[PDB]
Amino acid sequence: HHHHHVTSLYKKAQIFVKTLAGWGITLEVEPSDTIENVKAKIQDKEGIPPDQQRLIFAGKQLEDGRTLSDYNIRYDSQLHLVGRL
Amino acid sequence: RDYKRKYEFFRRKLKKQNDIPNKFEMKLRRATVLEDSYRRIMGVKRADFLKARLWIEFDGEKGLDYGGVAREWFFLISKEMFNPYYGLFEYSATDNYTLQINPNSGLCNEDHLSYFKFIGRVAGMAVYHGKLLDGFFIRPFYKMMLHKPITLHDMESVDSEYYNSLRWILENDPTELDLRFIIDEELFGQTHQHELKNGGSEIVVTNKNKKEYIYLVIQWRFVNRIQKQMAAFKEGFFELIPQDLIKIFDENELELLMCGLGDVDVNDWREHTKYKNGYSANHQVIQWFWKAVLMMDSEKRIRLLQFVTGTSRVPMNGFAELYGPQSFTVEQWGTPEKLPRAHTCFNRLDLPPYESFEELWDKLQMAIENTQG
DSSP, rough: OHHHHHHTOOOOOOOOEEEEEEEEEEEETTTBHHHHHHHHHHHHHHHOOOOGGGEEEEEEESSSSSTTTTTOOOTTHHHHHHOOO | OOHHHHHHHHHSSOOOOOSOOHHHEEEGGGGHHHHHHHHHHHSSSSSGGSSSEEEETTTOOOOHHHHHHHHHHHHHHHHHHHOOGGSSSSEOOOTOOOOEEEHHHHOOOOTHHHHHHHHHHHHHHHHHHHBBBBOOOOOHHHHHHOOOOOOOOHHHOOHHHHHHHHHHHSSGGGGOOOOOOEEEEEEEEEEEEEESSSTTGGOOOGGGHHHHHHHHHHHHHHHHHGGGHHHHHHHHHHHHHHHHHHHHHHHHHHHHOOOOOOOOHHHHHTTTTEEEETOOTHHHHHHHHHHHHHHHHHHHHHHHHHTTSSSOOOOOSSSSSOOOOOOOOOOOOOOTOOOOOEEEETTTOOOOOOOSSSHHHHHHHHHHHHHHO
């Protein structure tokens, strides 16, 4: 929210992720990241716990061990967020 | 109009349980209502346990008004159950606020079906305890609950431009468009065709077989891919409400039976209110009256609505839709020593001209508490 934006301004230093609700946040990351820590990035921007998420690229449910490069994601790779149950 | 006699008979036919504890206990955290409500409720093998007076307590909060805390729960859980974020439900389209069972819910969550049953139980609970779920669903949903057919007509209210596309085909020659018996669907970025019948990809749509085309597209849009989910829902719902008892309502009534808003919008209420015998929108006493209604909570507002109209049913859409047809009225009767009184017959409040806001607040609140007896 406001905090996420303000914190970025002071960072020493683009992809989209959509939900079935209509809205979709846009994250900034480097493809070295795993799945686990990107869930945290969502925890930060929108206040959703990392447990409470399923991440899906190319219609395939994504694994924690692998990285973004290991699942061939690129700049502006559209991702999909649906709640865990 | 006959709904009043129907709803009376309905509740009179709804049998009380005589083998079940005095209260259904729920110990939930607001942060995790869905999880917490789901575990507790799907734990209970006998549905009847859920008919006990709902004793709900959030985050340790002790000794609050039982029927008011229920009100909150039904709202908050409805907010979570139906959140399209989860993929059980979804919006009928983009630029639509109404809801429908998501066909791909099982792709989203592998245990979608027990969650559907759960929602059914929670919905049947709402009914059983004369409370409502906060949900805008498409009429098809309510039709399917009565095992009633779906039609081309039904698509209009849901999607007009798509309805028009099929209406066009009904009235015109489709040869132009080189269509097949397939519908393409996008899910998680990927696109997929779906054959409407066996080998539908090879079958051209023509004048000779377009009425079949239209029919099949409807079933695919609304029925075929949500049978398992809707079944589950219906199972849970009928665990609490006998299906024979629900049969007396139609699809319109059945939205009024189980859906509605958990708070009365005040602007809407004020918009559709008449005044008699000196009172007027900018009259001082009327100014104070609405100040009160504004500064109530939803529970106090609904108790007031019952006091004056004789119901607690918030329809959605309008206070215009409030049946002869009679809207809310506020008339001057009596003196400040008299408490105000209502006439559910006329949807009318008789309000004496009080000295202050606080007098009006107190005298009114007492009068409502006098009907709680």
